[PDB]
């Protein structure tokens, strides 16, 4: 309400793609040919949830 | 019983493809052309055996 902002969490194109993102994002896929991967950008990152 | 649930074990499709669960699902081959794997998920994870 105050910040009008929306965070977004890890989501990828490719189950691929998503293997790499769960041992942090040093070696993540970013993307590929025309796939693509979103990192987690949110306060939630980091935690156990 | 009281949950209606069942674990899964350290199991794949090829002993060739078995050969990467002595090192954790860090690196664990998931999927080869057809050649399928599923990671320990269970409370016996990690454990002794």
Same mark, same amino acid.
């Given at each position: 309400?105050?910040?009008?902002? /929306?965070?977004?969490?890890?989501?990828? &194109?490719?189950? /691929?793609? @998503?293997?790499?993102?769960? *041992?942090?994002?040093?070696?993540?896929?970013?993307?590929?040919?025309?796939?693509?991967?979103?990192? *987690?950008? &949110?306060? @939630?990152?980091? @935690?156990?949830?």
């Amino acid at each position: 309400g105050l910040f009008q902002e /929306a965070y977004p969490i890890t989501c990828a &194109s490719d189950p /691929a793609l @998503l293997r790499s993102a769960r *041992d942090g994002e040093a070696h993540a896929r970013e993307t590929h040919f025309t796939q693509y991967l979103i990192y *987690d950008a &949110s306060p @939630l990152k980091g @935690l156990s949830l």
